[PDB]
Scaffold this active site. Structure first.
Site, short mmCIF file in Angstrom:
data_model
loop_
_atom_site.label_atom_id
_atom_site.label_comp_id
_atom_site.label_asym_id
_atom_site.label_seq_id
_atom_site.Cartn_x
_atom_site.Cartn_y
_atom_site.Cartn_z
CD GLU A 1 5.27 -8.23 -8.25
OE1 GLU A 1 4.95 -8.27 -7.04
OE2 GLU A 1 4.67 -8.88 -9.13
N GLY A 2 4.68 -2.86 -8.36
CA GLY A 2 4.66 -1.50 -7.87
C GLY A 2 3.25 -0.95 -7.86
CB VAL B 1 1.99 1.16 -16.53
CG1 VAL B 1 2.04 0.39 -17.83
CG2 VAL B 1 0.56 1.52 -16.17
CG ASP C 1 8.53 2.20 1.37
OD1 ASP C 1 8.01 1.40 2.18
OD2 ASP C 1 8.09 2.37 0.22
#
Ligand SMILES: Fc1ccc(-c2nc3cc(F)ccn3c2-c2ccncc2)cc1
Ligand SMILES: [Cl-]
Length: 306
Positions: free
Chosen positions: A16-17, A21, A127
């Site tokens: 999800e980023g 990792v 963001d």
């Protein structure tokens, strides 16, 4: 070796980023789980060394996880922080892509408090999206409280000692997600506190309506799609977005769009505006959220919902 940061074992991968990792971890000292973040060394965008220092700055603030380790390990940078639960985007999909009024209100008040604490520490977020707001873990005291993570886009906006705002400027690169960014960001203007709050306003209508009118537009290039998206935001008043919804949501978005660049938002007044929604409709703010009724009352599951 499977142990990084001296005291942290690497477990399963959570993502999800981007494809950053990320992993689930376990402190081999006490057994508490963590969220390990890797970053390739000698990359074109180094931002992990600064995301650590942002978590130490906000260390002790409610809703911001703690940072526990950062160091070199082979050809990677590693940041260990607390492990949290699903995102508001995850719980959104599991409730039918629609949140009730009480849960949108109750979450909104917590999101406003988290953003204000970031602003009190001389930072703006740049963001805002529900994907970066996560609840806690099952059985914990903060199991259903809203948390804020990922500060790779956070930007200093005033001096820590003179408290002088950054000068206004324009002609900047588009930064953020086009679905939630403010009108000022679409125009390439410098972002300030007012733009985090307008982005929060777009997320509220996203939860209530299930969708926003500027979703699914057609454009040949990427740049022309962001222009067409920002154009729909100037053509749609706040009243039409509030069709069949409590008008206090339209008042919020209109007010944060009328704030000066260097002005300080009335945070407490916005939260009291969103609270009176529950008074008009005879509801209490006890903390009952929609995802607390999933799966017969057990809550969110693993293989059934994900
Ligand atoms: F050091 C770090 C920095 C950021 C994260 C992180 N990023 C994203 C992006 C997302 F869309 C959803 C969740 N997360 C996390 C995260 C996941 C679980 N528990 C804590 C944080 C993790 C570790
Ligand atoms: Cl979209």
């Amino acid at each position: 070796s499977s142990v990084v940061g001296l005291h942290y074992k690497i477990g399963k991968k959570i993502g999800e980023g981007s494809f950053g990792v990320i992993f689930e971890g376990t402190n081999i000292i006490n057994g508490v789980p963590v969220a390990i973040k890797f970053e390739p060394r000698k990359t074109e965008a180094p931002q992990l060394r600064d995301e650590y220092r942002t978590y130490k700055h906000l260390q002790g603030c409610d809703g911001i996880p703690n940072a526990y380790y950062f160091g070199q390990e082979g050809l990677h940078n590693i940041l260990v922080i607390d492990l949290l639960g699903p995102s508001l985007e995850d719980l959104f999909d599991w409730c039918g892509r629609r949140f009730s009024v009480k849960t949108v209100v109750q979450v909104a008040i917590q999101m406003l408090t988290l953003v204000e604490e970031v602003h009190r520490h001389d930072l703006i977020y740049r963001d805002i999206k529900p994907d970066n707001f996560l609840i806690g873990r099952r059985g914990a005291t903060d199991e259903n409280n809203v948390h804020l993570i990922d500060f790779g886009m956070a930007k200093q906006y005033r001096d820590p000692r003179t408290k002088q705002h950054i000068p206004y400027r324009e002609k900047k690169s588009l930064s953020g997600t086009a679905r939630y960014m403010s009108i000022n960001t679409h125009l390439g203007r410098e972002q300030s506190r007012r733009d985090d709050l307008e982005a929060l306003g777009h997320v509220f209508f996203y939860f209530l309506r299930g969708q926003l009118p500027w979703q699914g537009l057609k454009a040949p290039t990427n740049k022309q799609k962001y222009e067409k998206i920002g154009d729909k935001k100037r053509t749609t008043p706040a009243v039409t977005l509030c069709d069949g919804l409590p008008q206090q949501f339209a008042e919020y978005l209109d007010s944060v769009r009328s704030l000066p660049f260097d002005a300080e938002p009335p945070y407490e007044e916005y939260r009291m505006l969103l609270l009176s929604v529950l008074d008009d409709l005879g509801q209490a703010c006890d903390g009952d959220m929609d995802w607390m009724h999933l799966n017969g009352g057990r809550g969110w599951d693993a293989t059934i919902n994900k």
